[PDB]
Amino acid sequence: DIPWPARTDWGGHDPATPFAELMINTHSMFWPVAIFIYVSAIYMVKK
Amino acid sequence: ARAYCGRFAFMLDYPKSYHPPRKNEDGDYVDPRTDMLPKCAAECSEWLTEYNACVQRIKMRTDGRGNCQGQYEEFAMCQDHCIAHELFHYLK
Amino acid sequence: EEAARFANQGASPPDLSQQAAAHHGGCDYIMSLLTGYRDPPAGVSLRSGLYYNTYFPGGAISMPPPLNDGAIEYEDGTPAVASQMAKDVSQFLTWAQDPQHDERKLIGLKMSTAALVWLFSISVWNRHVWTMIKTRRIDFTKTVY
Amino acid sequence: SGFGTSYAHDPKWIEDWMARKRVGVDRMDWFFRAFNRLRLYELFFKSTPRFYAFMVIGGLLGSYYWSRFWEQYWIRVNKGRLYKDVPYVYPP
Amino acid sequence: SPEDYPTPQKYLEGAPIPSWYSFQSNLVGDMDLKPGMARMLEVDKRLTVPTRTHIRFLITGADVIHSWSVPSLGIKCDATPGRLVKINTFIQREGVFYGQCSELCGTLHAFMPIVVEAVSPEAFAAHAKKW
Amino acid sequence: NPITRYLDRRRAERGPYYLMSNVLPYHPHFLWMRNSHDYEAAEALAARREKDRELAAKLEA
Amino acid sequence: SIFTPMDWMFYYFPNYSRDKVALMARQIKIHFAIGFALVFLVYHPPYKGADYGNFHKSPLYWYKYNQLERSGQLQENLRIKRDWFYDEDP
Amino acid sequence: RDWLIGVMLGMYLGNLCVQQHRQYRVDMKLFYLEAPEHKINWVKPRGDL
Amino acid sequence: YNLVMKVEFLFFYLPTIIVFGICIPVYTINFAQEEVIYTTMTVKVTGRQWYWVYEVESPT
Amino acid sequence: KDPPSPPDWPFWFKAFSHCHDIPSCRRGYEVYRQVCATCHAARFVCFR
Amino acid sequence: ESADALFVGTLDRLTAEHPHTDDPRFAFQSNQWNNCELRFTQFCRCTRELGEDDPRCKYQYYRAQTVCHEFLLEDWMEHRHRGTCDLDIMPDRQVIHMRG
Amino acid sequence: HIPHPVKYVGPRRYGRYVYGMNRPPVLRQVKDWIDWTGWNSVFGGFSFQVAFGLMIVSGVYLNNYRATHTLYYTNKPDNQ
Amino acid sequence: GRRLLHGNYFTRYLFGSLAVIWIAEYAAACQYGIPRHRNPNWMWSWWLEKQNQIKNGEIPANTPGYAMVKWNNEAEQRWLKTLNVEAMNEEFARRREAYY
Amino acid sequence: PPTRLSTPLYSEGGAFTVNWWRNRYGLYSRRQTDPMLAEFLFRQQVKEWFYDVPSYNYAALVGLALGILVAVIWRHFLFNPDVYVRRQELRKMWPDRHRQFAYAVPYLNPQLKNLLLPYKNSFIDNEPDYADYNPVGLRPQRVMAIRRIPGFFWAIPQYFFEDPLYTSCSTKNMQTIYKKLGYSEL
Numbered sequence A: 001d002i003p004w005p006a007r008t009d010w011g012g013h014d015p016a017t018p019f020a021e022l023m024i025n026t027h028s029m030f031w032p033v034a035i036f037i038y039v040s041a042i043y044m045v046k047k
Numbered sequence B: 001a002r003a004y005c006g007r008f009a010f011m012l013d014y015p016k017s018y019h020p021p022r023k024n025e026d027g028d029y030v031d032p033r034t035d036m037l038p039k040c041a042a043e044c045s046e047w048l049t050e051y052n053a054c055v056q057r058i059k060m061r062t063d064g065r066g067n068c069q070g071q072y073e074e075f076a077m078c079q080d081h082c083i084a085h086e087l088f089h090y091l092k
Numbered sequence C: 001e002e003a004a005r006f007a008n009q010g011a012s013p014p015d016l017s018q019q020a021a022a023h024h025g026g027c028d029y030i031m032s033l034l035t036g037y038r039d040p041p042a043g044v045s046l047r048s049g050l051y052y053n054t055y056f057p058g059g060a061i062s063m064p065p066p067l068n069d070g071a072i073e074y075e076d077g078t079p080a081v082a083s084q085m086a087k088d089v090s091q092f093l094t095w096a097q098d099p100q101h102d103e104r105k106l107i108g109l110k111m112s113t114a115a116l117v118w119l120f121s122i123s124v125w126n127r128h129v130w131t132m133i134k135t136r137r138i139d140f141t142k143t144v145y
Numbered sequence D: 001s002g003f004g005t006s007y008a009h010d011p012k013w014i015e016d017w018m019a020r021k022r023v024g025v026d027r028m029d030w031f032f033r034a035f036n037r038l039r040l041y042e043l044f045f046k047s048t049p050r051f052y053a054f055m056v057i058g059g060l061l062g063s064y065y066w067s068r069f070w071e072q073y074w075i076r077v078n079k080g081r082l083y084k085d086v087p088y089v090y091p092p
Numbered sequence E: 001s002p003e004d005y006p007t008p009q010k011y012l013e014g015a016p017i018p019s020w021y022s023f024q025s026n027l028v029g030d031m032d033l034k035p036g037m038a039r040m041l042e043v044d045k046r047l048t049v050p051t052r053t054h055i056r057f058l059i060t061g062a063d064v065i066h067s068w069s070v071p072s073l074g075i076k077c078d079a080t081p082g083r084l085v086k087i088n089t090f091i092q093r094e095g096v097f098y099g100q101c102s103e104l105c106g107t108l109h110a111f112m113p114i115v116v117e118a119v120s121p122e123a124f125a126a127h128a129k130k131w
Numbered sequence F: 001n002p003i004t005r006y007l008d009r010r011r012a013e014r015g016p017y018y019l020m021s022n023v024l025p026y027h028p029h030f031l032w033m034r035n036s037h038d039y040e041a042a043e044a045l046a047a048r049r050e051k052d053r054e055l056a057a058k059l060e061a
Numbered sequence G: 001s002i003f004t005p006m007d008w009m010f011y012y013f014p015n016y017s018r019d020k021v022a023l024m025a026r027q028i029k030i031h032f033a034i035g036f037a038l039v040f041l042v043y044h045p046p047y048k049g050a051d052y053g054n055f056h057k058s059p060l061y062w063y064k065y066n067q068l069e070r071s072g073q074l075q076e077n078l079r080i081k082r083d084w085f086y087d088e089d090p
Numbered sequence H: 001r002d003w004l005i006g007v008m009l010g011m012y013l014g015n016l017c018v019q020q021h022r023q024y025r026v027d028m029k030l031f032y033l034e035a036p037e038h039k040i041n042w043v044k045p046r047g048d049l
Numbered sequence I: 001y002n003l004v005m006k007v008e009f010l011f012f013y014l015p016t017i018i019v020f021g022i023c024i025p026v027y028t029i030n031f032a033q034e035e036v037i038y039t040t041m042t043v044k045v046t047g048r049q050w051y052w053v054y055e056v057e058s059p060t
Numbered sequence J: 001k002d003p004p005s006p007p008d009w010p011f012w013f014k015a016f017s018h019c020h021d022i023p024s025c026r027r028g029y030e031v032y033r034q035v036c037a038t039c040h041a042a043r044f045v046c047f048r
Numbered sequence K: 001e002s003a004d005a006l007f008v009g010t011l012d013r014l015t016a017e018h019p020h021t022d023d024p025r026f027a028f029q030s031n032q033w034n035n036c037e038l039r040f041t042q043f044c045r046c047t048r049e050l051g052e053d054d055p056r057c058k059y060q061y062y063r064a065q066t067v068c069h070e071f072l073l074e075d076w077m078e079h080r081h082r083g084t085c086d087l088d089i090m091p092d093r094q095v096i097h098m099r100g
Numbered sequence L: 001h002i003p004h005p006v007k008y009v010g011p012r013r014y015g016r017y018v019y020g021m022n023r024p025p026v027l028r029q030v031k032d033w034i035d036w037t038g039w040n041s042v043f044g045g046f047s048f049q050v051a052f053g054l055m056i057v058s059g060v061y062l063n064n065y066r067a068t069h070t071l072y073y074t075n076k077p078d079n080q
Numbered sequence M: 001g002r003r004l005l006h007g008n009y010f011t012r013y014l015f016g017s018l019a020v021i022w023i024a025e026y027a028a029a030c031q032y033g034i035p036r037h038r039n040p041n042w043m044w045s046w047w048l049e050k051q052n053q054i055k056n057g058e059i060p061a062n063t064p065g066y067a068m069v070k071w072n073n074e075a076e077q078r079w080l081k082t083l084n085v086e087a088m089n090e091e092f093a094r095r096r097e098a099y100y
Numbered sequence N: 001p002p003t004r005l006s007t008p009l010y011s012e013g014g015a016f017t018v019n020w021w022r023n024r025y026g027l028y029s030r031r032q033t034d035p036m037l038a039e040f041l042f043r044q045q046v047k048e049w050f051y052d053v054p055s056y057n058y059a060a061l062v063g064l065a066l067g068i069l070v071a072v073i074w075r076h077f078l079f080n081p082d083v084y085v086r087r088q089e090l091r092k093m094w095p096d097r098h099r100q101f102a103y104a105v106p107y108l109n110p111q112l113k114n115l116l117l118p119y120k121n122s123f124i125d126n127e128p129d130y131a132d133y134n135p136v137g138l139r140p141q142r143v144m145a146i147r148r149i150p151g152f153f154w155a156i157p158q159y160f161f162e163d164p165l166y167t168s169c170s171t172k173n174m175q176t177i178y179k180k181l182g183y184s185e186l
């Protein structure tokens, strides 16, 4: 509904429509893949 | 001489599942075919426009002559081909 | 027939013993006809007792639309809708036409499969005896052993 | 190349194909050795009366079990749709 | 022919054809804010809509490109001149959902918020009847 | 924000849940507004609450 | 070759790979035809793919379905857990 | 071979967010069904100022 | 060489797999936004400098 | 101007290895006895 | 009465019985501008045949409002009253086939 | 390219011009000229216009004449 | 003398591309069942009926379309004040006599 | 890849071969001034670009991307109801454009749209079937999928029959709850 202080709200917050829920879950679905892509690559940044 | 032509079952797309007919507010089951009529009419829109055009052309004629059976039989054959592909899935 | 005609505006209800195979389309023609009643096309006007049907030759049939939802109650509980009754009476009339349909198809299955094995035996035989002929070498000024 | 003309000739790949005569190779001999260990020739085929008895007795037993197999095949494909598979409930 | 202009039978028999009502929604100024109002998001006329109903929003822009954004409803449609974009929505819970214009539209791009309040269908009908 | 309040309760029940909004100020003017008040709003808010109580009793009927 | 290490293509199919320039052209053409076919044979075909009574049910679907069917979990899972909005206040 | 350690470390850290997402969906399904935070016949129109 | 070639293949096709894993989700969510729904009410929204005009059907 | 060709319905018995669905045939007898029989006859169909 | 009666007769009927739903001819696109212009042209042609007072033409205007924003309609309705609306020029005074 | 021979098989020289005596017929000369300068340019140059003209003029029968007897709902006269 | 492109590249890719475009379009029409018969006229049925009446002599020749509608805009009211179809027909008749 | 100029390079026949590439590689080259040097530079380029295994991966990607691109362009022109190249319909008012309206419904129902819409229940927790029913008939009635979308949807169970709350979150149970309160029709 309205922004609240010091909230991460990663991927969205307070959906009030089925489409709004879809948007939040699409981001949540891809987020672990993004973490994998980052962690897997960064771990090899070294001599 | 015989009712049907035989085919491989892979060529005969028999319904793999059964969806029961919807029930009306009264509680009487609604005919699956009647529910499928609007959807199949949309799939045959091109022929329906031809038929609707004929109706308006015969409406203008000031004599009493004019029919649109020819175009209705093409629309009906189309709507029915659509029904055949999905009707037995709602029938036991 | 006269009595039947006099009860159906002169039209004769045909015997349904072989009707499942007496029309082009076969069983499909029964299913289509019973579910093929429609409002008359524009410009077509039908007298009392004449109804429009897309699959009857001509479009106008003296048969009142026979299937109405809830007309009967199936003993097994199947929902009684016009399209179900059509699918079921078409099935029954197809059976009535040729009650030996299942025996014909079970014995046909055993014959067709056996015939395939038979084809393979006569083929190996044909290939064998004709090898004698198709690999011979006739020489005139040459000799190779 | 030259397909469809008076200059038509076998392509190189058809000619390479015919250059592989497989002389001396026998990759299916294992099957014949194994079949010969059944001693069908020494026991049945060699003698004409016994060859006749193999065709008769083997056709009696083969016909029966072939029928048996395809009867079971049919009983399975049409499960639930056969008269024997659906006992009738008399109306009350 | 009259039948080339399809109309429901009820209206042909004298039923009143519906009218439409338009209202303007403006930001509440800093000096006009009340003790509890949210700064930069409050408006003087909110848009009331019924919940648990399929609503079609047709969005366009008269002069420049604005953008109608309601984050809680998952809507962000550009109000472009010449395009009447259709957006379908189905609100599931009551509340007040605040949004802001999402396309730089001039000096006061930051001062045209979007406030939508979703109420029960019975409440919406009473509101619409009175306002 | 009813779904933020529900999800906070669910998370807190399961495990350790920490919100910055709970511990820290949300505005930077907090250093100067220790004793600041709007007395005009206080009187208006109290009056509206009193009227609301009367309306509630009437609604109860 | 699709999803194929071309080192393998070079080793196992030496004669097909002899002309590497021609091999590259086929790589482009094959994947061009695949992309073109996807649009006009998987996406475009009109009034198709709406047979929801024919949802594929894989061997794993049935393994897990029968397991739950054997126990009461399938019945319990399908049961509607709540069909009222408000609880009754004592 | 070491790069595999990174794959496994990135698969563990990713799975943590999968579990959070999994629990999130369970919670969402219970909001409109059981959560007292969900209120109906509650919000009343404010009206024009 | 053999090991290096396999790594280079993975450097290219592991991302390709991930993209393919997103492709199906992307199609579905796009189809969902553009779904013909049986809407029963229309609200017209016009954006002007600097305010939002709303046109709504009035109850009869 | 031949009569519209009937559509190709997917009856069970149309496949090579398929039978007549007895449950449907039984219901079909009921439909024939209670609807079609009023006007039509099946002279060559016997109860046996 | 027939289930497919809406599609029969015209494609126009579909939105006439369901005013707030997608028109079959424009449902593929989110932009509904062309939909508004067709609906206005249909209101213009109704009045020419039936007059402004006819309930049919009044409803054809309600249908036009369902898809056309008011600021566009007011402008286009003034052009129509003057006699400069290009969607209402009588066909024998059109110039579309002239000089090309 | 692929090296090929000169395809001109006509007369390489008519002789010295002597008041236009002992020279081929005009049409023969035109044909020899195009043979000498190449028919590929003729076909290439005229191809575009031939195509456009054939398509436009073909409408005289395909779009106009045929159409007059194409509309199946026109042959029927009203009050007949 | 070494060649980079097809020996007949310009004609090949020009006419060739046109051919592929035309053939692909026919295939697309068949798959969607689009009517392929060209109509050069407007489809306003009431208007086409008025035009037949003019061709049949029921409506006098050169009668404007705004002289036949049931609603007139302001500019067409201006024109109706100076419209004299009878005089126009007589003038055309005089021209024919002079020409012959 | 041979290292001696005496050993010839195999070439197929056609428009993209080793011989075809040799003819055109040095057309604009100032460095291929004699046969020996020209062949050395030609084989150097061929060795570097065509005998490089990873280079073939990019060839696949360009083909796939370009094929999709050409087809999406063609599809718009050939089928999209809103793209006009012919003018017959553009010389008529909107109500009279029947030939163009014929593209509308077929274009509104592509195969992939019918195949993938049932899988919305992998993205929506509450009432994923809120928009399934539509009485008009422009599109097919939608039935929710029986399985999760393959890939990265580990947060939901592989099959929805496994989920305990799935049935209670359906638009049908929600409609039952709200209809029992008289709250709303849907």
Ligand SMILES: CCCCCCCCCCCCCCCCCC(=O)OC[C@H](COP(=O)([O-])OCC(O)COP(=O)([O-])OC[C@@H](COC(=O)CCCCCCCCCCCCCCCCC)OC(=O)CCCCCCCCCCCCCCCCC)OC(=O)CCCCCCCCCCCCCCCCC
Binding pocket: L039, L040, L041, L042, L043, L044, L045, L047, L048, L049, L051, L052, L054, L055, L058, L061, L062, M007, M008, M009, M010, M011, M012, M015
């Ligand atoms: C009983 C009978 C009954 C009836 C039966 C009817 C049956 C049907 C009849 C119709 C015929 C059907 C035929 C089918 C099979 C055809 C097979 C065939 O031979 O085709 C190939 C034939 C020629 O192709 P080709 O064999 O490749 O050419 C051989 C060359 O000689 C190869 O040599 P080249 O390539 O070396 O050629 C020279 C080339 C050499 O060039 C080069 O070296 C390359 C240079 C490239 C770069 C150029 C640089 C830029 C240009 C600079 C110069 C500019 C100058 C102009 C400036 C203009 C400024 C305004 O130069 C050029 O070509 C280009 C330069 C010349 C100037 C270009 C001018 C501009 C062109 C672009 C615009 C074109 C459109 C103009 C429109 C109008 C104006 C707006 O093409 C056609 O015939 C066309 C297609 C035909 C089929 C489709 C027909 C459809 C309609 C049919 C309707 C018929 C009537 C039906 C009635 C039905 C009633 C029932």
Ligand SMILES: CCCCCCCCCCCCCCCCCC(=O)OC[C@H](COP(=O)([O-])OCC[N+](C)(C)C)OC(=O)CCCCCCCCCCCCCCCCC
Binding pocket: L010, L011, L012, L013, L014, L029, L030, L032, L033, L034, L036, L046
């Ligand atoms: C109507 C409006 C337009 C009017 C203006 C038209 C402008 C174009 C006029 C072009 C005229 C060009 C004259 C060239 C000079 C000729 C000199 C001469 O006498 O030569 C003798 C010479 C004598 O031959 P020779 O001695 O040179 O022989 C050379 C050596 N051997 C024998 C080996 C070949 O012969 C010729 O006439 C050669 C030239 C013939 C050129 C013919 C060109 C025709 C151009 C018109 C095209 C019409 C197309 C119609 C549609 C076709 C459809 C497919």
Ligand SMILES: CCCCCCCC/C=C/CCCCCCCC(=O)OC[C@H](COP(=O)(O)OCCN)OC(=O)CCCCCCC/C=C/CCCCCCCC
Binding pocket: L047, L048, L049, L051, L052, M014, M015, M018, M021, M022, M025, N069, N070, N073, N074, N076, N077, N078, N079, N080, N081, N082, N083, N084, N085, N086, N087, N103
């Ligand atoms: C040289 C001799 C004279 C030639 C004279 C030609 C004159 C006319 C030239 C006009 C431009 C070229 C196109 C001609 C098309 C003729 C057929 C035609 O009318 O096509 C119409 C048809 C659609 O018509 P409508 O019915 O109005 O729309 C319905 C709903 N979509 O349009 C077309 O097909 C033509 C327009 C597209 C042309 C190009 C083909 C489309 C794909 C382009 C792909 C681009 C990317 C790269 C491709 C690389 C190679 C694969």
Ligand SMILES: CCCCCCCCCCCCCCCC(=O)OC[C@H](COP(=O)(O)O)OC(=O)CCCCCCCCCCCCCCC
Binding pocket: G002, G003, G031, G034, G037, G038, G041, G042, G049, I016, N060, N061, N064, N111, N115
């Ligand atoms: C950059 C590297 C690129 C490498 C190449 C990537 C190609 C990826 C192609 C994946 C295609 C999967 C979907 C297939 C269609 C489908 O399931 O689609 C499903 C639909 C409907 O199936 P159902 O109705 O039976 O459920 O299928 C059809 O209706 C017919 C589909 C015909 C497909 C022909 C065109 C594609 C041919 C692809 C050949 C190459 C495949 C390579 C696989 C690795």
Ligand code: HEC
Binding pocket: C008, C011, C012, C013, C014, C016, C019, C023, C030, C033, C034, C056, C057, C061, C062, C063, C064, C066, C067, C089, J031, J032, J035, J036, J037, J038, J039, J040
């Ligand atoms: C049970 C549901 C049925 C079935 C399966 C059929 N009918 Fe009738 N029918 C009647 C009449 C007068 C006719 C003759 C019509 C005419 O030709 O004028 C028919 C015809 C048929 C056919 C044959 C159609 C044709 O191609 O000849 C078939 C297959 C058929 N019927 C099947 C009359 C009646 C009834 C009188 C009220 C009733 C009831 C039915 N029919 C019912 C059935």
Ligand code: CUA
Binding pocket: E065, E066, E067, E101, E102, E103, E104, E105, E106, E108, E109, E110, E112, I047
């Ligand atoms: Cu308006 Cu920004």
Ligand SMILES: [Mg+2]
Binding pocket: E102, E103
């Ligand atoms: Mg923007």
